[PDB]
Design an enzyme around this catalytic site. Structure first.
Site, mmCIF file in Angstrom:
data_model
loop_
_atom_site.group_PDB
_atom_site.id
_atom_site.type_symbol
_atom_site.label_atom_id
_atom_site.label_comp_id
_atom_site.label_asym_id
_atom_site.label_seq_id
_atom_site.Cartn_x
_atom_site.Cartn_y
_atom_site.Cartn_z
ATOM 1 N N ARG D 27 0.125 -22.150 -35.377
ATOM 2 C CA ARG D 27 0.788 -21.036 -35.587
ATOM 3 C C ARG D 27 0.970 -20.018 -34.411
ATOM 4 O O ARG D 27 1.919 -19.157 -34.619
ATOM 5 C CB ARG D 27 0.538 -20.493 -36.821
ATOM 6 C CG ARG D 27 0.543 -21.346 -38.203
ATOM 7 C CD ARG D 27 0.178 -20.707 -39.355
ATOM 8 N NE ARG D 27 -0.033 -21.658 -40.472
ATOM 9 C CZ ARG D 27 0.231 -21.434 -41.696
ATOM 10 N NH1 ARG D 27 1.031 -20.500 -42.153
ATOM 11 N NH2 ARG D 27 -0.159 -22.465 -42.580
HETATM 12 N N1 LIG Z 1 12.092 -23.952 -37.200
HETATM 13 C C1 LIG Z 1 10.644 -24.301 -36.555
HETATM 14 N N2 LIG Z 1 10.559 -25.133 -35.601
HETATM 15 C C2 LIG Z 1 9.342 -25.277 -34.808
HETATM 16 N N3 LIG Z 1 8.153 -25.187 -35.611
HETATM 17 C C3 LIG Z 1 8.296 -24.620 -37.153
HETATM 18 C C4 LIG Z 1 9.435 -24.012 -37.492
HETATM 19 N N4 LIG Z 1 9.082 -23.626 -38.591
HETATM 20 C C5 LIG Z 1 7.821 -23.749 -38.833
HETATM 21 N N5 LIG Z 1 7.177 -24.229 -37.926
HETATM 22 C C6 LIG Z 1 5.887 -24.838 -37.644
HETATM 23 O O1 LIG Z 1 5.072 -24.932 -38.714
HETATM 24 C C7 LIG Z 1 3.957 -23.947 -39.013
HETATM 25 C C8 LIG Z 1 4.321 -23.462 -40.408
HETATM 26 O O2 LIG Z 1 5.052 -22.330 -40.425
HETATM 27 P P1 LIG Z 1 4.761 -21.190 -41.410
HETATM 28 O O3 LIG Z 1 6.279 -20.525 -41.453
HETATM 29 O O4 LIG Z 1 3.632 -20.300 -41.134
HETATM 30 O O5 LIG Z 1 4.824 -22.052 -42.973
HETATM 31 P P2 LIG Z 1 4.198 -21.189 -44.122
HETATM 32 O O6 LIG Z 1 5.147 -21.907 -45.247
HETATM 33 O O7 LIG Z 1 4.575 -19.753 -44.261
HETATM 34 N N6 LIG Z 1 2.350 -21.651 -44.494
HETATM 35 P P3 LIG Z 1 1.430 -20.855 -45.404
HETATM 36 O O8 LIG Z 1 2.110 -19.381 -45.748
HETATM 37 O O9 LIG Z 1 0.072 -20.694 -44.708
HETATM 38 O O10 LIG Z 1 1.423 -21.359 -46.966
HETATM 39 C C9 LIG Z 1 4.017 -22.946 -37.934
HETATM 40 O O11 LIG Z 1 2.773 -23.034 -37.179
HETATM 41 C C10 LIG Z 1 5.522 -23.540 -36.917
HETATM 42 O O12 LIG Z 1 4.666 -23.795 -35.773
HETATM 43 MG MG LIG Z 2 3.407 -17.944 -45.041
#
Ligand SMILES: Nc1ncnc2c1ncn2[C@@H]1O[C@H](COP(=O)(O)OP(=O)(O)NP(=O)(O)O)[C@@H](O)[C@H]1O
Ligand SMILES: [Mg+2]
Ligand SMILES: Nc1ncnc2c1ncn2[C@@H]1O[C@H](COP(=O)(O)OP(=O)(O)NP(=O)(O)O)[C@@H](O)[C@H]1O
Ligand SMILES: [Mg+2]
Lengths: 466, 492, 467, 82
Positions: D27
């Protein structure tokens, strides 16, 4: 005596008697109400309190209201004048046709027949319907699982069974509707009068109707299967008949009892079902057997949940099932009536030791010849009809004439069909099918065996014009 | 004199929390009886216990404190009822919430009445038209019946109900009074904006004038959402018991089941499968049996029920869905796949079933429905080899071509319900083979043009199908000449 | 009035009052403590005792300890003054920049706008994200839900939307961190100071911040969502203007409710959740809406527990939305970011009478071919590719190119993607998929379409991927 | 801020460390790398995620255009290198 309401929680009511307490299962009359309210004692909580399960709506109840012990369990009218009458779980006539004037009243609870009163004989209840008696025979004082609902004429098959037992064996029937939809209750009522089994004028009725409707509390749905069994139990012991008992549907009896055990506060068993499931089934299903005086043979319509046969509900039911009757869309769409699947319906008494040496080999021969037909079905559609060998061409043409002879017109359905109804005696069926297997009718056409009684009416039909 | 406290007709709050008030006293309270707190709030005595009464709060429980005086006022839990409610958006108890003043209601009905018995009912035979081809031809609905809308989220569940309401305008503006249908839509646990989006969609159809909208939204308390289905039911029964016809849509019963469960768990009733109490089957069984068709002995009126059930991952074997499936007379199954694949309404022809079915549809529809039932049945068995069948026989190759084209005919857009006579005509073309040579993709445009034409030029023919209630040999030939020559011109 | 602590278990503290008893929802002040500890009355337990939920740590609490009743529920600072300031659950500025100098104090427990107060008008809010704008576009003044399991891109997606919309947004915006990372909030505080949404020098701030992240005790993470919306509530009602509410994560509200549910004395519902799950969400979500008085574009990141959407908490949330955007781990697994599910995203405005019949038919067609491919996937995986006819396997190669053109290099994900972020206009997106569906790009390989902006770039990437 | 997932299949198939390139994420990302690592790992993760997919889909015997042959050749080599 008298007791007071100490607690009202949903469909579970608590009542405190001062002196002597009603034993578990004694009916309670709640006084001062609009209609009748029955409370069934389930527990003794101590401190002169009982825990009761209502059979009707528990609204408008005041803490302290006087409740009367009836000194006995839920007592219901029994006797010949319960035929052609719609009863409810507490005996009350729900057909608005005046109170049922029976001499005797019997409690819906009662112990299963003693070991000494059991029938050591295994006999066959001849139904008159060919498919049943040959391939999936009903055990007299046994229990039969009816698969598949309406849309194939379930209601008819039931009515014809009522007619043919009353005809052939002089025994009455009892329909116990567990979780009956009120539309389907009304619809089943007039269907029975219009066909002949219920007679609104005289006393020629052959069925007693008990309705545990859906809009009634779990107490009423869990005990109505007994209220039906007790009306049937009178005709077994008091008049010595070979009785017939319909339960539709048995799964809603299991779910009824699960709700009760869930209501009383018992820790649920596997898959959410009640801990008392085994007995909750045993204490009722063991009243349905052949005694010294008579016998009750029960046809039970089964709902399997998530089409899962290992689900405890059908699994606990199957331990008590001696035979099955599958009503199928596929067979009904072909035109074969009754819509029974000849290979899918199986029976415990399909044994040379029980029915006989002849009955067995003829039934199995019919069973094999239909499997062979299915086994050659892909070879028929995709090879070339005229390239089967002599023995493969023959068994195909013989097999088609077998499944047509399963077809049988029904007496009950003379008002609809217009054609004459048939009761085919036991040995008529056995020899009839044996001859087709032996090829004695290799010359007769297919349409000859369709919708006929015995084999005689089939050869006569074969003539027609040319 | 001093600290006497009329424990017989009154009492005090021993403990309040989570919409549950444990009240001391009230020695004369009946079960399910409406009470009144200090703050003016209402509540129900759902639990009668030796030393207390557990009351479910009708509102915000901040206003109730410890030792608040709880009063019996002999209340009968009943809702305003009658034709004055049509066109209004009332709350879970009949109060107006559409800012159009009070309702001139005169008759008022209890919410906890018993369903009619076995006797005063007659067999379902009158048609209840949804204006949805797929439905009226495959899963037909009749007056007095109960039919379940059941699919996952956003599968088109509400749309089925919606299109039905709009369909009634046809009958409700005409002269044939028996064939009129009054609509009652109950929003249970929904959000206010969606309920606002609803009534607008009914206003724009000019359908609102004959629609009672009973609303208990997600912000409304647990008991409010629990009574709301029954409150609508009583409103529908008025018409039923007075020789008229009413159609009610509980949207949805899965959300009332949640609202009930909360109360039981918090009144501390035993939990069962998925934390549901023993009487949750009993909650819905007494609600849906209340819909019936009365005989001419009781005025001959009817109430017709349409429950909605939301399933998760298509699981129809979940406790609540299993309940309602058995409760009702039939179901319509909507699937995510069918939806995005294109087949909208996403009605699964296979699973979907109605018991009343045949006897509920007009003799005109009967004439082409069972044929379509049989042909789509034989289609679905071979459906998987629709492309991988170069070397199939000409029989199954016809049964595949027959099916794909019928499937296109059952397709429909929202908000455009079809009259029973318009339905049979567009189904007559494909069932009698007069489309088996047309290219699959061209069917929807043909239906639109062919229907546009028959209404515009052959009013007497469609009228005859409506009048006669059947396709006579005359009309049969008249339909054949139009389709053959219109289709030939179409492909020019 | 004065109360004594009679019991301390977890974040649940019972207090007894000798005289005047404080009602439900009321905020209590715990006497003699370093940093202010607020209790919230949840239940009346009887015998002049109340059960409360602490808004912070209950470590060091002595039985009998004095507690004063503040006479009301938690009242927080509201107004233009709140802008550029990080408020916590109780409106005490955790940005270290002095008191929030406001005229008014509104309460975090308010009533949901009435049925008559509702608005029905709806227009498309162009995001510049291909996946949303084509299949399930967002309504202006509408409720927007971002479903997703742990690590699929709920946060990354909600961040792009702030960049793409809020920055060039004329009105006010309110971000509210509920139960997520304190770290994620810090980045965004600095990255909204750098950009210039929050100005440290003057009062041209467009954003008001509220935070109650996974560091705080349940009681706090259970209420900080209300603190965020009440900020929005003023800006909507007492200033009429367009508001942009951003919540991450709103599932944390339900979760923190469960962490205490048992200790309140509840029989657990399904999945070890609270029985009040429905009514708790209903009184909260119905406050997050556009009314006849004012507009609120809400975007809510919704967590998915154990990657199951049917989990009671996110499953109940579905019925509260106007447009839902669902994310899959399986889609993200294949490097497809954003990992939006084309068959699981539903919009209220996906009506041709709003977006245009061209827009509608293209999108419906986009999904159909991806839907058709999903049905083929298991058949071709065992029984080869050759068994598909020249019009079947033509859809397979198209669907994989439509699947990959749905991928988009975000301007926020520069650190992850390794590409410059792209913003695609509405008509450039519809023309994009229209041509591929028409089959005008059947000659180009799939990899040309993977991670690009507009469609011209998919041709550009093919040419570079050539030689 | 992300996770590293390890599978037995990858472990036993030879790949050690048995990291699942598709399921694991970081992340903080490139911001946690040296500008020397970023010059060679800037797009490698999303590249291998696309490779791991097209590897199991291309094993169905379909004739592959050199453009998807290029990603197949690169993905095998970089997995061996890690
Ligand atoms: N558009 C994108 N392009 C490249 N990588 C992405 C993109 N969206 C997410 N990722 C990758 O996937 C991971 C997850 O993103 P994140 O926004 O933290 O998901 P999340 O649903 O908020 N997880 P959580 O809140 O802990 O249940 C990140 O570490 C990013 O590196
Ligand atoms: Mg989140
Ligand atoms: N026959 C149809 N043709 C085209 N679109 C339809 C049809 N039926 C429904 N839709 C669309 O599909 C979406 C879902 O339909 P809807 O009737 O609201 O299902 P639903 O089950 O009530 N959704 P929800 O209440 O959130 O579970 C709506 O946004 C409609 O625009
Ligand atoms: Mg809906």
């Amino acid at each position: 005596t008298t007791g007071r309401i100490v607690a009202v929680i949903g469909a579970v009511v608590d009542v405190q008697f001062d002196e002597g307490l009603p034993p578990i299962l004694n009916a309670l009359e709640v006084q001062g109400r609009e209609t009748r309210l029955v409370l069934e004692v389930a527990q003794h909580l101590g401190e002169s309190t009982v825990r009761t399960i209502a059979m009707d709506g528990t609204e408008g109840l005041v803490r302290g209201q006087k409740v009367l012990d009836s000194g006995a369990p839920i007592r219901i009218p029994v006797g010949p004048e319960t035929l052609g009458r719609i009863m409810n779980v507490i005996g009350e006539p729900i057909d608005e046709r005046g109170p049922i004037k029976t001499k005797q009243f019997a409690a819906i609870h009662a112990e299963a027949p003693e070991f000494v009163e059991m029938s050591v004989e295994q006999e066959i209840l001849v139904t008159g319907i060919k498919v049943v008696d040959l391939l999936a025979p009903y055990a007299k004082g046994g229990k039969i699982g009816l698969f598949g609902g309406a849309g194939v004429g379930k209601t008819v098959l039931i009515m014809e069974l009522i007619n043919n037992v009353a005809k052939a064996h002089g025994g009455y029937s009892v329909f116990a509707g567990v979780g009956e939809r009120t539309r389907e209750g009304n619809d089943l009522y007039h269907e029975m009068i219009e066909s002949g089994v219920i007679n609104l004028k005289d006393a020629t009725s052959k069925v007693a109707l008990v309705y545990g409707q859906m809009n009634e509390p779990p107490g009423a749905r869990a005990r109505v299967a007994l209220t039906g069994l007790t009306v049937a139990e009178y005709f077994r012991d008091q008049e010595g008949q070979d009785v017939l008992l319909f339960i539709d549907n048995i799964f809603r009896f299991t779910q009824a009892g699960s709700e009760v055990s869930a209501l009383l506060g018992r820790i649920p068993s596997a898959v959410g079902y009640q801990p008392t499931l085994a007995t909750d089934m045993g204490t009722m299903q063991e009243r349905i057997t052949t005694t010294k005086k008579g016998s009750i043979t029960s046809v039970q319509a089964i709902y399997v949940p998530a089409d899962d046969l290992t689900d405890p509900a059908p699994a606990t039911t199957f331990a008590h099932l001696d035979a099955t009757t599958v009503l199928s869309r596929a067979i009904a769409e072909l035109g074969i009536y009754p819509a029974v699947d000849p290979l899918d319906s199986t029976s415990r008494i399909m044994d040379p030791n029980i029915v006989g040496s002849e009955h067995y080999d003829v039934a199995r021969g019919v069973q094999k010849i239909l499997q062979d037909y299915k086994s050659l079905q892909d070879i028929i559609a995709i090879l070339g009809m005229d390239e089967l060998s002599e023995e493969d061409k023959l068994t195909v043409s013989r097999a088609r004439k077998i499944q047509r002879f399963l077809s049988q017109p029904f007496q009950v359905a003379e008002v609809f069909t217009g054609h004459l109804g048939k009761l085919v005696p036991l040995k008529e069926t056995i020899k009839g099918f044996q001859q087709i297997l032996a090829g004695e009718y290799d010359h007769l056409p297919e349409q000859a065996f369709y919708m006929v009684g015995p084999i005689e009416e089939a050869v006569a039909k074969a003539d027609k014009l040319a | 004199a001093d600290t006497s406290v009329d424990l017989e007709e009154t009492g005090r709050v021993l403990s309040i929390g989570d919409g549950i008030a444990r009240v001391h006293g009230l020695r004369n309270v009946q079960a399910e009886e409406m009470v009144e707190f200090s703050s003016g709030l209402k509540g129900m005595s759902l639990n009668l216990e030796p030393d207390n009464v557990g009351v479910v709060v009708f509102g915000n429980d901040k206003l109730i404190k410890e030792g608040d005086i709880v009063k019996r006022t002999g209340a009968i839990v009943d809702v305003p009822v009658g034709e004055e409610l049509l066109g209004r958006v009332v709350d879970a108890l009949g109060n107006a919430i559409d800012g159009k003043g009070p309702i001139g209601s005169k008759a008022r009905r209890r919410v906890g009445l018993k369903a009619p018995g076995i006797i005063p009912r007659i067999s379902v035979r009158e048609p209840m038209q949804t204006g949805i081809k797929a439905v009226d031809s495959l899963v037909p609905i009749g007056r007095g019946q109960r039919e379940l809308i059941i699919g996952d989220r956003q599968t088109g569940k509400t749309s089925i109900a919606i299109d039905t309401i709009i369909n009634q305008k046809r009958f409700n503006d005409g002269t044939d009074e028996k064939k009129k249908l009054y609509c009652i839509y109950v929003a249970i646990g929904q959000k206010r904006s969606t309920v606002a989006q609803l009534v607008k969609r009914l206003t724009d159809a000019d359908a609102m004038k004959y629609t009672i909208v009973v609303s208990a939204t997600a912000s409304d308390a647990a008991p409010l959402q629990y009574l709301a289905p029954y409150s609508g039911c009583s409103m529908g029964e008025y018409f039923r018991d007075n020789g008229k016809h009413a159609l009610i849509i509980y949207d949805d019963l899965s959300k009332q089941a949640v609202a009930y469960r909360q109360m039981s768990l918090l009144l501390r009733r035993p939990p069962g499968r998925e934390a549901y109490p023993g009487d949750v089957f009993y909650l819905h069984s007494r609600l849906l049996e209340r819909a019936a068709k009365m005989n001419d002995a009781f005025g001959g009126g009817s109430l017709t029920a349409l429950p909605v059930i939301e399933t998760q991952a298509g699981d129809v074997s979940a406790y609540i869905p299993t309940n309602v499936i058995s409760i009702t007379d039939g179901q319509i199954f909507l699937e995510t796949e069918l939806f995005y694949k294109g087949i909208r309404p996403a009605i699964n022809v296979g699973l979907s079933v109605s018991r009343v079915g045949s006897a509920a549809q007009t003799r005109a529809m009967k004439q082409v429905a069972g044929t379509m039932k049989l042909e789509l049945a034989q289609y679905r068995e071979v459906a998987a080899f629709a492309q991988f069948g170069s070397d199939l026989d000409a029989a199954t190759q016809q049964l595949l071509s027959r099916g794909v084209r019928l499937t296109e005919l059952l397709k429909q857009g929202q908000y455009s319900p079809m009259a029973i006579e318009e339905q049979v005509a567009v189904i007559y073309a494909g069932v009698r083979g007069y489309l088996d040579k047309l290219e699959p993709s061209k069917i929807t445009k043909f239906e639109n043009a062919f229907l546009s034409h028959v209404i515009s030029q052959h009013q007497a023919l469609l009228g005859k199908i409506r009048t006669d209630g059947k396709i006579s040999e005359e009309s049969d030939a008249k339909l054949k000449e139009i389709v053959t020559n219109f289709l030939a011109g179409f492909e020019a």
